[PDB]
Subunit: 115 residues, 3 copies
């Protein structure tokens, strides 16, 4: 059989080196690279309305510091980042269209994930 | 479950969160605490801050190397301090818990 | 993800080279602002140092051990590209590279 097996690439590595690295470069990334700072924008309600916060900053730390059990867990944190943003903001805001753009892209990049 | 993941996410998270963790979350600062002989007596100092950093930054060859570091932390404390001491009773509690958690180590 | 090979590069190879007398110029980027080298970041299109390599091993950057080896090579060749041969600094890299090549020969498989 001259057909050799398709290359075995790790999923979480791909998440760091490919998925995250793409989202991070993108022009709309900056509001998601650190946590939402609810002091410095006047919003003392943020932390009551958002159960469990999330950002690419934290996802990056986690990929770099052996946090994630499996690639499923890392994806959860991405979804949670977006869904946090859609809840706490009023649809058709600017933050929401930026998040919708990063999500469209996210789902492209996830679809080409290895196995 | 890779054993080193279990040590980071379960063993250390449990211990780090405990009442008595704080004296163990960073190196014993012999200068601040004004203990000149500490580094002479304790040849291999150790603490949860350093073990955490090691788990996060791929230092350990395997789980047993990481378990020895926890044991070093506890015994270092039993060597340097006198029994009965507050610091010792705390380390004793953490050891008890550390051992319960190590009994559910996957293989 | 972290193969026993990458483990060897962190614990044995990098640790050995970091401790050597000649390491210090390769422990962080060449600060070309400080040294008044405007041509450096123009002649060296892919800078490397052991600082960056240490970071990358600690933070699961590498696809595999061989990508890390590539970084070490680039570090040494960057040095040989920018600097006149015979300079103090080149002889230092050569010393470290000789030592690298020794340690890399005992690299385990899988
Ligand atoms: C406030 C704001 C004005 C803009 F023009 C564009 C953005 C993205 C804005 O949102 C942020 C700007 C800065 C920051 C910092 C860097 C401080 O964390 C965060 C946000 C912001 C980010 N995320 C993820 C959100 O879900 C919501 C955010 N702010 C919404 C906000 O404060 N809205 C107030 C007008 C009502
Ligand atoms: C000094 C002390 C007084 C107390 F009332 C309780 C504790 C735990 C104490 O121990 C420590 C307090 C702070 C620190 C800091 C955080 C600065 O590194 C360390 C210790 C301490 C911790 N561990 C693990 C030790 O083995 C020994 C420590 N020092 C005890 C000490 O100085 N003992 C001599 C004064 C008798
Ligand atoms: C300039 C110099 C003089 C010496 F006596 C020894 C060394 C290693 C020297 O090189 C460096 C000294 C410091 C630094 C710092 C730490 C600031 O980034 C870098 C270098 C240096 C390092 N590496 C890896 C190089 O390839 C080249 C470096 N300097 C080249 C240099 O500045 N040459 C000047 C004559 C042009």
């Amino acid at each position: 059989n001259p057909n050799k097996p398709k290359r075995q690439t790790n999923q979480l590595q791909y998440l760091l080196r490919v998925v995250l690295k793409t989202l991070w470069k993108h022009q709309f990334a900056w509001p998601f690279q650190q946590p939402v700072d609810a002091v410095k924008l006047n919003l003392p309600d943020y932390y009551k309305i958002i159960k469990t916060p999330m950002d690419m900053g934290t996802i990056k730390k986690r990929l770099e510091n052996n946090y994630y059990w499996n690639a499923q867990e890392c994806i959860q944190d991405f979804n949670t980042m977006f869904t946090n943003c859609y809840i706490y903001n009023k649809p058709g805001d600017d933050i929401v269209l930026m998040a919708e753009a990063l999500e469209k892209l996210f789902l492209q990049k996830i679809n080409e994930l290895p196995t």
